[PDB]
Design a protein around this ligand. Structure first.
Ligand code: CLA
Ligand code: CLA
Ligand code: CLA
Ligand code: CLA
Ligand code: CLA
Ligand code: CLA
Ligand code: BCR
Ligand code: BCR
Ligand code: BCR
Ligand code: LMU
Ligand code: PQN
Ligand code: PQN
Ligand code: SF4
Ligand code: SF4
Ligand code: SF4
Lengths: 161, 69, 730, 81, 138, 195
């Protein structure tokens, strides 16, 4: 009922701010994002890696196969993996040497669940390095790979119009 | 005071959190190793860096016939 | 102070050493204060704590300006009468190339003054009276010499009303701080009773006295001087004595008429101003509104009303203050006055409102760039003065908790966005061009962005322009063509040397300039917005409003702590706008001549001052000095020994003054001190210095002498560059 | 040094003279008289940023003061954050 | 944060105030006396009404509390406290410590002032080029 | 007086690059012996320009040469632009020229690379760390606040460049542009010729 929730700016204290509002926090947005890392960690990553790798994968095709350097290609290759498959490699390790910001190094192991987590204090890290690996390892097999059922597909395609 | 949609209605109520979705698509370990080389790593990643980048660059240029600049 | 207070000196103070801030100018001597005081001659922290007068001063300063325009332009209208050019031109227009102004021949001077004319040596003019002017029908040189003194009348009097305030014992609070009427009046009967009154002297007299001028004669072969009342036979032509209507209304019959009016749309042929006859109707149809409109009303009433959930409580009593801020009710205004001047700058060039413009090229682009720098020089201001609000004006807090207090609530936010906006632009809004170079210099056009190469394919044509002319599907009735001739549909046919006005169709290469404008308009505003918003307190300084909107910079710490403030956001925001406008100008003339400005020739084969070089070649940003700066400008650096020459001969100075600014812009301050003493030493040996402690420039004065010079430098450079490539071919 | 900009003077009296500065300065130590006899250049300075608001007012009668630590904190920066 | 509201001091929301590295370093909350409820300026673009107490709002960085302080003694009162919080409680305890109101004596603390030598003629350059035998490290 | 003066008596033990000092006293600034060196390098980039400028125009004209031309056209300032500077860019400016690309393209693109590197000096030079740092204070409320951008830690905290640094960088920027423009200018014109 309350003019917008029991009317609060933030979670409650005003003072951090973020002026929590729609597009910050509406039952409708907020939800379109929790198997995914925004709030909770669904599973120990390893898997999120490829839905991340892959979805972002078959992107970067018409960007560099329809806007390519000398464009609209007559080659077997593009439509194409090509260079883009090269980008997921540069990308994916530009990605790794960031997982040298956190190492923090363990196996604990839980994608299995005890007791509704809370994480407890997930906010902030508590991702060890042996986590950020299995993500940016999922990234490679998500990038390269997610680059082929892009071109594998014939483009049945829609014409400008 | 009849009307009021007497506690109307609530939800339980206007909580949400406690089970909004079953979590994830099955795929369990349809990958698990499956491809190891980032699933193995300690230690790697040079190894790979010279490899990927050696092909990309190596065949990336040389030959067959020109097609020149 | 006390030379001698209150009651008991008429006797004026000239002398004993004089004034400001309480450890007042010391006694003991300095230089800076002579620079202080021209600056910040009015700020209004000082003179009185209590607004009291000042509103009682700013009415007087206003009077002075109104006079002054008047002193001006009597001058102008003089000049315009008795150094005539005008009588001669008007029989003669489209031959003439017109002056008001002549040198005297002393020393060099007189290269300058080169035959303009109906047979006299001149300096050619590009502000047009001679076009405001066409309107007077009656004519002759000695009058304008009456309109002239009529000017000096309004002045002396509209300048003894300024005696007749402040200095005279004079007024008090209520009179402004009860507003309740003020727009009521203003818009009703002046906004109205001018445009209204202007109607009455815009068909009465002007219409007829160019209705049969648009043929020739030697004037007065046409128009008697008073001629135009109880009389009128002459109205009969140009229409009826209403013959039998009554006070409009209807039980009226036309089998053939409808009152003067009769709307025009398009341009006159053989005077392509646009019809001198929609000019009455439109002004008439204005005034009414104003006539009805300035009849609101007394206030919070409307403002205190509607509220929303995002929307602002503040909206209400959105300002008891407003009546007495001032600095705020000027800042708002400048944005409008200012932003309502450069909307002139379009409707002008794509819809001339004076007889003989377009054909007259140079005498309405000067315009479109003068009017253009005000619809900009007055906008950055319109921020400065808000910053002047945002810091100081009210004694105390009691604005409270609104809409503003709202906007600020977010503030590392409204400006958090706007930022990315710009780097999205810039990358899509300039490196775009740089592609071309890097790849047309690499050279493979297949893949440029050329209007031909990257595919839209050869139409601009349909967006609005094509719906706009094409106009009468409509509830629209009217008038054979357009509101503006340029819009795509319609016509070959406009004018007699020359082309005046034609579609202008754009495509791409109108597409992306149009976008650089975006990014230029946007990062301008970022700095002013974030500037005026973070006015008083910041995440870097809290203790930030405490002297100043000015202070130099807080101090070497916090890392930088230099620019900050908001004099300086209104210092680096000018710096941009100088581009904002400086590149919009660069846009219009390269278009308006590459296409449009014309010639007609047998069978009308159009010959644009440049056969559309624009085509494939503005897109390259070198083409912008291949086709612009190095192409045109060849007329600036050829201009010696001539008549205009004063442009080529300026174009070096002021193309010097600019390259003097950097010295003021780029340098320290205890430097010219450290230097100023070596000096001061040599000075003392001969016994020639100390008294009035010679001092270096006041950190921010130094910035004041940047900027200001960087502009009157970098600007008149083109004022020269221009008048030198429309005078002479074009 | 790690904050070393000398504002010292000789009176170190602080009435209609100088106070301004975010935390840094507790002074009022005395030294065995100087007229007003509150002395020194400083209190312990590992707390706040780098103003020269430090003179601007009340004499230093040699150097002004200024930026100079070099050796620079974050808290001493303003930004980390 | 509902389950405990301790609050004394009254904004509503803002974009302003502390973002993450107040948790990961050093915390900085200021507290105060009040009479009868008044409407205030802030740090961070503005403003609120107070009432009473603890009257213990927390700020980002120390410049900000003191900054009111100027703020807080025009419109007056004696009493303003500012403390520094970690994550993990104490050391560095900021306004508490002896007296307050600098411009008093009990003690010295601090400061010196001179280093080794006084203001007069360092026309004299720096000297020996850093060796760990001679008193150049304070 | 790197050792220093009145406005600074002290100015020492960092003699060189201590750039800036607090406002007050008279107002004190680029008054380190570095920032006079900093200031110096503009006139070493103005002499070493008048001088070099000179040879070439002379030489140029000397080679299919009228000499005459320098002789009447050394004399005055305008038409130091007009011919030289305005004559004889001629060729280079189109290597691009819309109807396709002619022999020199490196040079003219360098010559505009020349006008950018230069111009973009000015920021550094009319900007002064204060304005930059502050909006980076708002612009580092983004991520910290905005999703899918978050947790995610810099190892180095965002900042705006110190208060000596940018007097350099605008310069070491002013210079390349400038020195990379004449580089590309003379060559891009003593190569076609006419001389
Ligand atoms: C309708 C509004 C108009 C009015 C009435 C005012 C009024 C005021 N402005 Mg203001 N301002 C305006 C428009 C206006 N402004 C605009 C459009 C801008 C943007 C540029 C500004 C930017 C601005 C700033 C930054 C400041 C003010 C300040 C002020 C206050 C100080 C006035 C003063 O001492 O004169 C100042 C005039 C001089 C000292 C004369 C010097 C003029 C030089 C620069 C010459 C200009 C170049 C010209 C080509 C030279 C003549 C030709 C020559 C070569 C022969 C005053 C209340 C000042 C303040 O502190 O607020 C209290 C503050 O300085 N204004
Ligand atoms: C030619 C100029 C140079 C450049 C490139 C810039 C660029 C910028 N200025 Mg700026 N400025 C300059 C000179 C320059 N300025 C000068 C001389 C002054 C004063 C004399 C200022 C005063 C000023 C102010 C007050 C402000 C700016 C702001 C900005 C930013 C606006 C946002 C934007 O669109 O940036 C991005 C786009 C560009 C920089 C242009 C495109 C660059 C091309 C060449 C692409 C290169 C990218 C490519 C991937 C290179 C990688 C290759 C590899 C070999 C390295 C932008 C960074 C404002 C800001 O930060 O707002 C966001 C702020 O308002 N400037
Ligand atoms: C003509 C071009 C080329 C080709 C063959 C494709 C083909 C494809 N793009 Mg694509 N794309 C291109 C250029 C191209 N793109 C360019 C230049 C961009 C600029 C960013 C994109 C940006 C883009 C995005 C963001 C996405 C795609 C998606 C897709 C795929 C899904 C088709 C669809 O609409 O969902 C069919 C949906 C249902 C049946 C339900 C498809 C394989 C994705 C997609 O289209 O999913 C909706 C994803 O949306 N593209
Ligand atoms: C709008 C501006 C203003 C400006 C810039 C000028 C500028 C000029 N006027 Mg002028 N004038 C003005 C208002 C102005 N006038 C007014 C209001 C009047 C009515 C009193 C006059 C009456 C007037 C006369 C009678 C003359 C000038 C002349 C001149 C020129 C001679 C220069 C001079 O005055 O000193 C030296 C010069 C171009 C002189 C001229 O045109 O001969 C070359 C001529 O002497 N003016
Ligand atoms: C406010 C405006 C302006 C002014 C001062 C005048 C003034 C005048 N008009 Mg007039 N007029 C105007 C706008 C104006 N007109 C416009 C816009 C139109 C056309 C839309 C006309 C169409 C018009 C006609 C047809 C006539 C006048 C006449 C007159 C004169 C006497 C009758 C009258 O209108 O008022 C005074 C009121 C009464 C006498 C009653 C008087 C000199 C008449 C005339 O010549 O003199 C009698 C008559 O010929 N006007
Ligand atoms: C934050 C407040 C509150 C809320 C929750 C809303 C919500 C809405 N307003 Mg709204 N409004 C408010 C206060 C509010 N308003 C206030 C105070 C005013 C006066 C200042 C308005 C003036 C206003 C107007 C003029 C409009 C809205 C519209 C809308 C709707 C957008 C259209 C849409 O999403 O469907 C579209 C979805 C499709 C699937 C199609 C949305 C339901 C728009 C509307 O009427 O709906 C389109 C319309 O533009 N509002
Ligand atoms: C009581 C009476 C009355 C009254 C009378 C009068 C007194 C009137 C008037 C009239 C009027 C009162 C008019 C007015 C008009 C105005 C106008 C018309 C305006 C103007 C202006 C201008 C022209 C300007 C311009 C400009 C611009 C645009 C901006 C800036 C620049 C310049 C300035 C150029 C009557 C009649 C009923 C009668 C009975 C009695
Ligand atoms: C030896 C000597 C000398 C010297 C001289 C010289 C060497 C000079 C120069 C000069 C230069 C080398 C430059 C300058 C320039 C100036 C100027 C330039 C001024 C002014 C201006 C104006 C008037 C303007 C106006 C305008 C406007 C209106 C706005 C914008 C545009 C323009 C700019 C157009 C003398 C004799 C003095 C003194 C004695 C000694
Ligand atoms: C521009 C110019 C000028 C001129 C001036 C004059 C001399 C004038 C004018 C103008 C005017 C002066 C106008 C007037 C007009 C008027 C009017 C527009 C009126 C209105 C209406 C009426 C008349 C009334 C009506 C009524 C009715 C409806 C019925 C009964 C009641 C009453 C009466 C209300 C001057 C010198 C400054 C110089 C510069 C240029
Ligand atoms: C500039 C690149 C061309 C691309 C646009 C071309 C499409 C439209 C055709 C030409 C446009 C110019 O329009 C022009 O047409 C004719 C030139 O042949 C001229 O035709 C005019 O001259 C003659 C005199 O009686 C007659 O043929 C026409 O009745 C008359 O309109 C006109 O001066 C002008 O109306
Ligand atoms: C060059 C320069 C100076 C030096 C400029 C000075 C000292 C200009 C002041 C010179 C005045 C205008 C000379 C006045 C003397 C005459 C008016 C007196 C005789 C009167 C006549 C009849 C000649 C600064 O002070 C400065 C300050 C801050 C940032 C940058 C700079 C900067 O770049
Ligand atoms: C833009 C700008 C900033 C902001 C700082 C910025 C924008 C740094 C931005 C990083 C750029 C994008 C890096 C690109 C440079 C590359 C050539 C990489 C450098 C490689 C080296 C190790 C040499 C300041 O801090 C500043 C301070 C004082 C005066 C003027 C200014 C100023 O103009
Ligand atoms: S000039 Fe002064 S205020 Fe400006 S940056 Fe330097 S030290 Fe700071
Ligand atoms: S500022 Fe100087 S004079 Fe004033 S108290 Fe401090 S040391 Fe003494
Ligand atoms: S500005 Fe200077 S004097 Fe003031 S607290 Fe900071 S370091 Fe100390």
């Amino acid at each position: 009922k309350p003019t917008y929730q029991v009317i609060q700016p933030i979670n409650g204290d005003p003072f951090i701010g973020s002026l929590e509002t729609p597009v910050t926090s509406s039952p409708l947005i907020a939800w379109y994002l929790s198997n995914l890392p925004a709030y909770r960690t669904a599973v120990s990553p390893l898997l999120r890696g490829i839905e991340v790798g892959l979805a972002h994968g078959y992107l970067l095709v018409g960007p560099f196969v329809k806007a390519g350097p000398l464009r609209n290609t007559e080659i077997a290759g593009q439509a194409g993996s090509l260079a883009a498959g090269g980008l997921v490699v540069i990308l994916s390790l530009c990605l790794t040497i960031y997982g040298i910001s956190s190492f923090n190094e363990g196996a604990p192991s839980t994608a299995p669940s005890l007791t509704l987590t809370g994480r407890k204090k997930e906010p902030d890290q508590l991702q060890t390095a042996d986590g950020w690996a299995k993500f940016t390892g999922g990234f490679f097999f998500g990038g390269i790979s997610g680059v082929i059922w892009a071109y594998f597909l014939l483009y049945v395609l829609d014409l400008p119009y | 005071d009849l009307e009021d949609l007497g506690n109307t209605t609530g939800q339980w109520d206007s909580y949400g959190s406690d089970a909004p979705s079953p979590y994830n698509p099955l795929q369990s370990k349809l990958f698990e190793t499956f491809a190891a080389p980032f699933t193995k790593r300690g230690l790697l990643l040079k190894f790979l860096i010279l490899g990927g980048g050696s092909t990309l660059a190596y065949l990336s240029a040389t030959a067959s016939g020109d097609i020149l600049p | 102070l006390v030379d001698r207070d209150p009651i008991k000196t008429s006797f004026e103070q000239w002398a004993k050493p004089g004034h400001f801030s309480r450890t007042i100018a010391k006694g003991p001597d300095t230089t800076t204060w002579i620079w202080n005081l021209h600056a910040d001659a009015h700020d209004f922290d000082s003179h009185t704590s209590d607004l009291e007068e000042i509103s009682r001063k700013v009415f007087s300063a206003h009077f002075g300006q109104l006079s002054i325009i008047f002193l001006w332009l009597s001058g102008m209208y003089f000049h315009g009468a008795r150094f005539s050019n005008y009588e001669a031109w008007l029989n003669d227009p489209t031959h003439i190339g017109p002056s008001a102004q002549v040198v005297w021949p002393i020393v060099g001077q007189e290269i300058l003054n080169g035959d303009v004319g109906g047979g006299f040596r001149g300096i050619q003019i590009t502000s047009g009276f001679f076009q405001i002017w066409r309107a007077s029908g009656i004519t002759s040189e000695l009058q304008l010499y009456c309109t002239a003194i009529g000017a000096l009348v309004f002045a002396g009097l509209m300048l003894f009303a300024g005696w007749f305030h402040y200095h005279k014992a004079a007024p008090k609070l209520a009179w402004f701080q009860d507003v309740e009427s003020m727009l009521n009046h203003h818009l009703a009967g002046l906004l109205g009773l001018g445009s209204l009154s202007w109607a009455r002297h815009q068909v009465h007299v002007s219409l007829p006295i160019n209705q049969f001028l648009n043929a020739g004669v030697d004037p007065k072969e046409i128009p008697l001087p008073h001629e135009f009342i109880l009389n009128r036979d002459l109205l009969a032509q140009l229409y009826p004595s209403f013959a039998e209507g009554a006070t409009p209304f209807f039980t009226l019959n036309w089998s053939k008429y409808a009152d003067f009016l009769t709307f025009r749309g398009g341009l006159d042929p053989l005077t392509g101003g646009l019809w001198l006859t929609d000019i009455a109707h439109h002004h008439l149809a204005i005034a009414i509104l104003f006539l009805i409109a300035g009849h609101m009303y007394r206030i919070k009433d409307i403002l205190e009303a509607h509220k929303g959930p995002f929307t602002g409580q503040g909206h209400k009593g959105l300002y008891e203050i407003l009546t007495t801020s001032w600095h705020a009710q000027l800042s708002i205004n400048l944005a409008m006055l200012g932003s309502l001047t450069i909307v002139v700058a379009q409707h002008m060039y794509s819809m001339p409102p004076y007889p003989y413009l377009a054909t007259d090229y140079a005498t309405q682009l000067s315009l479109f760039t003068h009017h253009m720098w005000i619809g900009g020089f007055l906008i950055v201001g319109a921020a400065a003065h808000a910053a002047i609000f945002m810091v100081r004006d009210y004694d105390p807090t009691t604005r409270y908790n609104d809409l503003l207090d709202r906007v600020l609530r977010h503030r590392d936010a409204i400006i958090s966005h706007l930022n990315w906006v710009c780097i999205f632009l810039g990358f899509h809004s300039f490196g775009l061009y740089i592609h071309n170079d890097t790849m047309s210099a690499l050279g493979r056009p297949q893949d440029m962005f050329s209007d031909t190469a990257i595919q839209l394919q050869p139409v601009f044509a349909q967006w609005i322009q094509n719906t706009h002319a094409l106009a009468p599907g409509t509830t629209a009735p009217g008038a054979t063509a357009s509101t503006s001739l340029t819009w795509g549909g319609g016509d070959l046919v406009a004018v007699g040397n020359k082309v005046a006005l034609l579609p202008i169709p754009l495509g791409t290469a109108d597409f992306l300039v149009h976008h650089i404008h975006a990014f230029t308009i946007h990062v301008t505003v970022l700095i002013l917005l974030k500037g005026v918003l973070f006015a008083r307190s910041s995440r870097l300084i809290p203790d930030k409003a405490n002297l100043g909107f000015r202070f130099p910079c807080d101090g070497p710490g916090r890392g930088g702590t230099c620019q900050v403030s908001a004099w300086d956001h209104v210092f680096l925001g000018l710096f941009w706008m100088y581009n904002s406008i400086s590149v919009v100008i660069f846009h219009f003339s390269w278009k308006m001549q590459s296409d449009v400005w014309g010639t007609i020739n047998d069978q009308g084969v159009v010959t644009h001052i440049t056969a559309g070089n624009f085509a494939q070649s503005s897109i390259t940003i070198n083409g912008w000095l291949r086709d612009f700066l190095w192409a045109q400008a060849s007329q600036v650096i050829q201009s010696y020994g001539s008549s205009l020459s004063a442009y080529g001969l300026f174009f070096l100075g002021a193309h010097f003054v600019w390259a003097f600014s950097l010295m003021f812009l780029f340098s320290g301050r205890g430097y010219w001190q450290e230097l100023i003493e070596s000096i001061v030493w040599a000075h003392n040996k001969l016994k020639v210095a100390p008294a009035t402690q010679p001092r270096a420039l006041s950190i921010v004065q130094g910035r004041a002498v940047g900027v200001t010079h960087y502009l009157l430098g970098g600007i008149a450079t083109t004022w020269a560059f221009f008048l030198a490539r429309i005078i002479a071919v074009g | 040094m790690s904050h070393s900009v000398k504002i010292y003077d000789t009176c170190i009296g602080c009435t209609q003279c100088v106070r301004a500065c975010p935390t840094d300065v507790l002074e009022m130590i005395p030294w065995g008289g100087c007229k007003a006899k509150q002395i020194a250049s400083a209190p312990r300075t590992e707390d706040c940023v780098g103003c020269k608001r430090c003179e601007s007012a009340c004499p230093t009668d040699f150097l002004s003061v200024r930026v100079y630590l070099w050796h620079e904190t974050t808290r001493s920066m303003g930004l980390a954050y | 944060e509902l389950d405990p509201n301790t609050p004394s001091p009254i904004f509503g929301g803002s974009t302003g105030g502390l973002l993450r590295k107040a948790q990961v370093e050093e915390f900085y909350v200021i507290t105060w006396d009040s009479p009868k409820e008044q409407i205030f300026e802030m740090p961070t673009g503005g403003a609120a009404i107070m009432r009473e107490g603890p009257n213990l709002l927390k700020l980002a960085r120390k410049e900000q509390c003191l900054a009111l302080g100027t703020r807080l003694r025009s419109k007056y009162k004696i009493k303003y406290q500012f403390y520094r919080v970690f994550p993990n409680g104490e050391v560095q305890y900021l306004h508490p410590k002896d007296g307050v109101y600098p411009e008093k004596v009990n003690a010295g603390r601090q400061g010196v002032g001179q280093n080794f030598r006084s203001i007069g003629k360092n026309v004299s350059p720096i000297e020996v080029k850093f060796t760990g035998k001679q008193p150049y490290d304070l | 007086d790197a050792r220093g003066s009145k406005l600074m008596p002290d100015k020492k033990d960092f003699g060189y690059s201590f750039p800036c000092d607090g406002p007050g006293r008279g107002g004190t600034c680029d008054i380190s012996a570095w920032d006079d060196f900093y200031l110096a390098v503009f006139w070493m980039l103005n002499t070493i320009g008048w001088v070099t400028f000179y040879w070439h125009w002379k030489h140029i004209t000397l080679w299919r040469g009228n000499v005459s031309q320098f002789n009447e056209s050394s004399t005055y300032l305008m038409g130091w632009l007009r011919d030289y500077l305005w004559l004889n860019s001629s060729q280079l400016i189109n290597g691009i020229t819309p109807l396709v690309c002619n022999s020199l393209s490196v040079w003219a693109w360098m010559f505009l690379f020349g006008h950018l590197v230069w111009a973009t000096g000015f920021m550094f030079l009319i900007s002064w760390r204060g304005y930059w740092q502050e909006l980076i204070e708002t612009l580092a409320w983004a991520h910290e606040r905005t999703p899918l951008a978050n947790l995610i830690r810099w190892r180095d905290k965002p900042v705006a460049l110190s208060i000596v640094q940018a007097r350099l960088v605008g310069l070491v920027h002013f210079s390349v542009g400038y020195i990379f423009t004449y580089a590309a200018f003379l060559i891009a014109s003593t190569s076609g010729k006419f001389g």
